[PDB]
Paper text:
With a typical circulating concentration of around 0.6 mM, HSA is the most abundant protein in blood plasma and serves as an important transporter molecule. The monomeric 67 kDa protein has three structurally homologous α-helical domains (I-III), each subdivided into sub-domains A and B. HSA can also bind drug compounds with similar physiochemical properties to its natural ligands and may significantly impact the kinetics of their distribution and elimination.
HSA–myristate complexes were crystallised in space-group C2 (with one molecule per asymmetric unit); DanN, DanE and DanR were added by soaking these crystals in solutions containing 5 mM of the fluorescent compound (see Section 2). The dansyl groups of DanE and DanR bind in the same positions as observed for DanN in both of these sites and make the same specific hydrogen bonding interactions with the protein. It seems clear that this moiety provides important anchoring interactions with the protein. Although the Glu side-chain of DanE interacts with Lys-199 (as observed for Asn side-chain of DanN), the Arg side-chain of DanR adopts a more extended conformation, allowing the guanidinium group to make a salt-bridge—albeit a long one (3.5 Å)—with the side-chain of Glu-153. Since the mode of binding of DanN was found to be essentially unaffected by fatty acid binding to HSA and DanE makes essentially the same set of interactions with the drug binding pocket, it seems likely that bound conformation of DanE would be unchanged in defatted HSA. Our results reveal that such compounds bind preferentially to drug site 1 since this pocket can accommodate the dansyl moiety in its central hydrophobic compartment in an orientation that allows the pocket to make specific hydrogen-bond interactions to the SO2 and amide groups of the sulphonamide moiety and to the common carboxylate group of the amino acid. Moreover, these anchoring interactions allow the polar amino acids groups of the ligand to be positioned within a hydrophilic sub-chamber that is both large enough to accommodate the variably-sized side-chains and contains counter-charges that favour their binding.
Residue numbers in the entry: 3 to 584
The structure:
Amino acid sequence: HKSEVAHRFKDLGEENFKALVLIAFAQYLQQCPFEDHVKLVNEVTEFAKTCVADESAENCDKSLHTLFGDKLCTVATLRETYGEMADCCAKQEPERNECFLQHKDDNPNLPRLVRPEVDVMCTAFHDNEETFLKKYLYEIARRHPYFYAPELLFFAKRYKAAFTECCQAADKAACLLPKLDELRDEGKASSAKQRLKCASLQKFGERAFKAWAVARLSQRFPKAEFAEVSKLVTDLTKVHTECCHGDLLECADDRADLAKYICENQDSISSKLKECCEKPLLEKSHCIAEVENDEMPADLPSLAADFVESKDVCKNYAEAKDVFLGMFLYEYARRHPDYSVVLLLRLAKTYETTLEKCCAAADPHECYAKVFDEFKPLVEEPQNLIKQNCELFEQLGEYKFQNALLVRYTKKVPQVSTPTLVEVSRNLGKVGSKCCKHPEAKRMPCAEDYLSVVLNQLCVLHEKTPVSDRVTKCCTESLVNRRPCFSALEVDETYVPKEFNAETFTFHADICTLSEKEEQIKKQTALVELVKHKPKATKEQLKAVMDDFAAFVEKCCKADDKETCFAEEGKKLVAASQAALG
Ligand SMILES: CN(C)c1cccc2c(S(=O)(=O)N[C@@H](CCC(=O)O)C(=O)O)cccc12
Ligand SMILES: CN(C)c1cccc2c(S(=O)(=O)N[C@@H](CCC(=O)O)C(=O)O)cccc12
Ligand SMILES: CCCCCCCCCCCCCC(=O)O
Ligand SMILES: CCCCCCCCCCCCCC(=O)O
Ligand SMILES: CCCCCCCCCCCCCC(=O)O
Ligand SMILES: CCCCCCCCCCCCCC(=O)O
C-alpha cells in the first residue's frame, strides 16, 4: 500500500524475503564476499520490519528500485571493485537501475564450484544448516545473474530436503550423490531453456514467439477459448520480454499478476489448476507454468471444416492474417498435446505458405483443398525418427545406444572435436532413456524439450569454434528448421581420414580402477577416434573391433601384472584391428 517493502515483506514472509534479498544482491555485487551480503540482507530486513510496524516511518514510502539502488551505492569499494559500475550511482532512477542491468556480467570469471565430499557436506549441513545453504545460494546466484531469483529459491529448498533425508541415511553417499546430480542437470536445463527463450525472442522477434506461445498454451489449456489464449499469450510475451531484460522486480510483478489473473479465471482456463492456485504467492507461477495438460474436449469438430472446406478461408484470412493463423494453431495445437510445439509451427508455417499462394489464384478452394495432405509427411518425419530410435534404445542399453549415436554422428561431422562429439552423443542418449520410457503419446513433446537445449548447447560451443559450415547452417537456420537440419546431415564423403596415432589407441590398467562414467568416456573417446581414422568402416567391422576390445579390457583387468597385459595384448589388438580395417 503506502509501503512497498512492508508489503513484500508481509507477502513473502521473513524467510523467503531474506533469501531473495540475498540472491538479488549476489546477482549485482557478484564480486563482494558472502559476509558482506549477509550484512546487507540484515540491514534491509531490519529496515523492512521498521516499515511493517509503521508504514509511515522514514523512507518506507520509497520504491524498491530506489531503496535497492541506494543500498547498492552504499558499498564503499564500489568504484574500486566494479569501477565503471560505480558511475551508475551518479545517475538518478530509473537510469540508475537501467545502468546496473547493463553491468550485470552474464558470465564472470569465477572458479568452477567444486562438489565437496558427502561427509564434509553433511557435517557442514548439520552443524550450521542456515549458513551452509545460504552460502551456496550465494555462490550459485553470483555465477548466474539472470537465473530467476524465486526459481533459485525453489531449488534451494529441494536441496535442503535432499540433505535432510540423505545425511541421515545409512549409506549417505548412495542417497545424496544421485540427488545432487539430478538437481544439477535440472538446474542446467532450466538455465539453458531460459537463455534459449530469451535468445529466440531476440533474433526471431515477437511474432515467432507469440506463435510458439499460442501452440504451447493451447496444448495445455485445450478448454479455454481462443480469446482467453490470446489474452494470455499477450501477457506472457510481456512477461518473458521483461524477465529477459533482467529486472527481477518488474519480472516478478508481471509474473504474479498473470498468475493471479489465471487463478481468478481458472474456471474458464483449465481444471488442472485448482492445486496450483492454492499454493503460496512465491509458488503459484512456478506451479502453473508446469501444470499438466488439461483433458481436451470430446465434442471437437474436424479442422477441415473451418480451414479447408469453408469458402471464406481467404476472406477471414486477409481480414487479419495472423489472428487467423493463430486460430489455426490454437485449433491444431489443442487437439494434439502429443505434438512438439515446433512441429505445430511447421504445419502452421506450411499452411501459411499455401494460403499465400492459393488465395491469389483463380479459385482458392481448388488450390488449397488438399493442404492437410502436405502435413502428413511432416508429422511422420518426427514420429518415425522417435520410433526408430526408441526401438534401438530398447535393445541396446543407454550406453550401447550412445555408442551407436557416437559412430553415427562422427561419420556425419568428422571435423568436430572428439571431446565435443562424446558429450553431445552422451546427452543425446540420455534424452533417449528419459523419453522413450514414456507412452508414445508423450514422447515427442519430451524429445522436443530435451533436444532443444542439447542442440543449443551444441550450437553455442561451435559458434565459438567454427568447425563446420553445415553445423553453422543448421545452427543459424530457422528455430523450426533446426532439428530437421541436423537430421538431414549425411555422411561426410569429403572428409579425409586422420593419420594413425599409436598413443591414441594404447591403454593402461588404470582403466580398471577408473569409475564407470570415466571408463565409458575413455572407451567412447577411443571409438570416436577410431571412426575418425577409418570412416569407411562398416558396422560389422567396427562391431568386431569393439567386441575384440571389450574382451581385451575385461580380460586384462582380471589378471596379474595388469600393465604387462594391456601392453602385450595392446600391441596385438591394434595390430589385428588395423588389418581387419584395411
Ligand atoms: C539448480 N541450478 C540452480 C543449479 C544447481 C547446481 C549447479 C548448477 C550449474 S553448474 O554446476 O555451474 N554447471 C556448470 C557445468 C558443470 C560444472 O562445471 O560443475 C555450468 O554449465 O555452468 C549451472 C546452472 C544451474 C545449476
Ligand atoms: C505463471 N505464469 C505467469 C507463467 C510464467 C512463465 C511461463 C508460463 C507458461 S509456459 O511458458 O507455456 N510453460 C513453459 C514452462 C515454464 C517456463 O519455462 O517458464 C513451457 O512449457 O515451455 C504457461 C502459463 C503460465 C506461465
Ligand atoms: C541452489 C541453491 C542451493 C545450494 C545448495 C547446493 C549444495 C550442493 C553443493 C555442490 C554444488 C556444486 C555443483 C555440483 O557439482 O553438484
Ligand atoms: C495470436 C496470433 C499470433 C500467431 C501468429 C501465427 C504465426 C504462424 C506462423 C509460423 C511461423 C513460425 C515463425 C518462424 O518462421 O520461425
Ligand atoms: C529491495 C529487495 C526487494 C526484494 C525482492 C522481492 C521480489 C520477489 C517477489 C516474488 C514474487 C513471486 C513472483 C512469481 O510468482 O514469480
Ligand atoms: C586401429 C586401432 C583400433 C583399435 C582400438 C579399438 C578401440 C575402440 C573403442 C572400443 C570401445 C567399445 C565400447 C565398449 O565395448 O564399451
